[model samples]
Target: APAWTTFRVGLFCGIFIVLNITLVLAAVFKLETDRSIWPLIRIYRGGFLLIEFLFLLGINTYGWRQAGVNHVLIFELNPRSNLSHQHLFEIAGFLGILWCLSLLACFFAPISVIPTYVYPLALYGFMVFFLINPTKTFYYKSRFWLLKLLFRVFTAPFHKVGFADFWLADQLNSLSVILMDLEYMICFYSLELKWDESKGLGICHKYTYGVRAIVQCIPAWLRFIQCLRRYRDTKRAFPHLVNAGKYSTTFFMVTFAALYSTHKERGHSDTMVFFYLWIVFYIISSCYTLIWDLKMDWGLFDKNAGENTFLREEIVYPQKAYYYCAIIEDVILRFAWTIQISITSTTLLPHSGDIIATVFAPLEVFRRFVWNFFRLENEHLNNCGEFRAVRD
Candidate 1:
């Protein structure tokens, strides 16, 4: 079932989406010249994509609520907390509208506005200030709630893992490239490359060649360490060690791919062994992950098959088709990169490999969106089995 929505939520999202489309359309027509800032470069995608994922979480919560999952209880939030899915929508919508305004701002350039570079940094600073205000305004509780979860992720090795903790980590897994884009944003602004002609578009990679891979690996590494901690705490290595191995694949895959890129750029053999190694690791990683998503994470394909067939018996989603459809989506999208490798953005458009990130990342996020419904449903069913809620 679709998540609950009211005209109020509808109006807010409508205004944001409506205004968002208009502003971007306006920007598209204005056109960027040699003098214009390349806000369309790496930074813009991650910024708004941040809003997209935030909004998606709200929608996921809405779906969770619709399925009677009792998310607030599951997360162990303050019973009196004022934050809800409505606030999530409100926040994401407002931030997104700000982006639309900023998109147009970038186009306006230094003709009348302060400076082109100022726009992104200003928006980023405001977002940070809003979250870290240390004042009681604009859902500060929820802001800190998020801050706390992020803190736990960074410090996962030191803490006993919780559902919300690892859940946040899983969300991070889908945002890996955006995390790298965050690095791109920093190099753009912090390095003053924003003023560079081409807006440091192609050149930024030279600075971050090694670093970007490390940045993209953060979430996978966090989850890997969390798995080790879980194994230590629970003394159950079957799944935790197994999960750790899955995350481990990213290190091998990223290293080989990075090597392939470096050598290819340096005029080394393009068909060198690294390419084959990268593909081997890529296939192994994707297959292992696809299996984990289906079997462990979603708890599908039960041998006990009670009336739901391939799905678990105590399903929360209304239709069996949802499970089948979701399974199909996971299989398709998990291997979607195969298609990406063959047909790149340059095949259709020129001067923008970043489009690869913009395209595939959203699909991954959508995949995460689908994963949420079943994942939470399984989490809820687990709670029911133990007769536990509110942190047992």
Candidate 2:
């Protein structure tokens, strides 16, 4: 039987149904007693986190087994998974689980602190849905149809231009960072605003920010290290990929240096300055990505001639999909940044530092631009770096 319809699936589904009912009962009990609900919230949140973690572990293991990557060493060897249909189902199921958690958290958490979480959780939830179920779903067919329609309408231009994939990934990466930061900032302020009344909020912010950063960053860094290890085992490195990673990391460090030198005290101005720097960095990255995208499109099209006709056709949808995804991401980032700036005030200018280094720091970006330009020109002249499938 398909996993979705099985009795075992119902067993997992029942947990979600029970959780929602439990939340409702708790809410009613608190309202009737006119007592503080924070204690109940703490209990629920802690339990939810543990339960979700276990669910993630079990589903991940099942999916890995189904996809033939269950071995302990497999992840160390190759971190990326080919998204088989079964794996997509696993992703969808995990997302459904996340949705249940979000509902439970939102209903129980206090209104003041909810902003810190709601955006991050909602955005992540939507992104997961967008990735794994863009068109339709068994659970929410009508709703998903509307989402799909809106997505296509918005992405039409990107489909025409061909730069969506990089755009989408960029959006995801950018928004994730921005929303996480916003949550941290909000938590810190909410707690500090009422030290006596809301010390718990402050402590929550401290641990949440610290723990989440460590949890996410460590895995990502290690995953890349694993990729490099694989290359080492193969006795060769893709020099271009290595160079790209090296330069990007160098640029990040440079940005941080400028930010540290330019930052004012941990006041509102400093926060605005930080936000502006990241926006500038993101713009630079997008520009480079666009340039590379155009080059790729050209190479793919040009190669489709007599001897490479197969290569030509294969690139078409991938190119269009890339642009489509990019459009979605670009819109999301713009929307997120707009809200952030509007919510905070506009006095984000840096102080007591060189204006150029503080606000108009583009030296690293210029270096990237130069390299990209040179690469494109070289590819045009030599046709050496044409897109090809790489396999071991």
Candidate 3:
């Protein structure tokens, strides 16, 4: 909306929403009972993936065509035009949507070797998409890096100034839990491969054993409560809540991972044996960790800022309530909030979100990866406050 001209985009979105709703309702109402709802979800996931793959190819070809066949032979597509910028955004959005869809599909299916291989491959694809096309960089960094930085910096400070509470904090905490669990699974698979046999059928029996257990036991109801609680808390705490709003992406990431992982690993004895409870714990723990990190970082930043910086005053909170409150209210107003900030950061306002994100995404991703590896604890805000609200 901000960067590209998109009346067509809105129309596309509307159609997509309609189709999605129709399909969901059909599945729910048993109109398509025999057609298989969960399997259909995989088809959608694959569709998104195919779209993303095609999108990547399209952009590269576009670049080649622009450069001419001779220039294309040298493999340099000059990124100096609006069309180039738009092409990159198109690719990024498709990849993000594909990532979200793939994650979602994992929840309903069984864990298997295909997903184990696919996970890294998808991430690598995303990484390539994320890194290429430097013209549309968010600020000085990539969009993804910017997002992670904001998560680390703004979120934590906002939490300190009473910007958010335990509920909201918990939701943010999920990012870390997911990262950890992902690492755990990766580790488990590696160890199983190294120490024991590979099961050699392009899958692992023990890993799937745990994966299946994890799926059925996922704390879906509790997660739903946690999300609602955070939404409520964020709306109460902050006057403005754009930064807090990134939770939507975070939510999509976690949920997509859950649904998609389950489906991808279906039918393997290892995946089915334990019912995937570990996966559930992984999601819950990640949500909790993200929230916890946000609050602690907020406290640390607020202490250092000393109430003088205008940007700090505007974005960071001294307490949790105000931040959470702002986040809640901004849900409706986020488009405006994000646009304003995005514009503020760049020559283009609406497109700035993308810029800010690009300039910062990769760095943030790397930072989080490191933190996950080290299992660092936030010294500033750990175990200090119990989030409390007024009694109804």
Q: For candidate 2, lDDT tens digit of each residue in 256-366?
A: 433433343334566566766665655554454443433442233344445434223322222355434443443344333322222221213323222222121122222
The 0-to-1 C-alpha lDDT of every candidate, in the order given, reads 0.72, 0.38, 0.36
Estimate, for each residue in 76-187, the C-alpha lDDT of model 1 and write its tens digit: 6777873667767878877887776666677655455376666777777788898888988877788899898888898999987887788889888877756766777877
- Model 1, runs deviating above 4 Å: 1-11, 33-39, 109-113, 192-201, 206-209, 267-271, 337-352, 383-392
TM-score-based ranking, best first? 1, 2, 3
lDDT of 3 by residue, 118-235 (tens): 5434654665455554666633243444344335433343333332232223322322223223433455447643433221121321234334223222323233333344456556
TM-score of 3: 0.28
Q: Model 2: runs farther than 4 Å from truth? A: 1-220, 223-247, 250-262, 266-280, 288-312, 315-392
How many collisions per candidate?
0, 10, 103
Residue 237, model 1: Cα distance from true site in angstroms: 1.1
Q: Pick the candidate with the highest lDDT.
A: 1
Model 3, residue 390: what's the lDDT? Answer: 20
> lDDT at 321 for candidate 3?
57
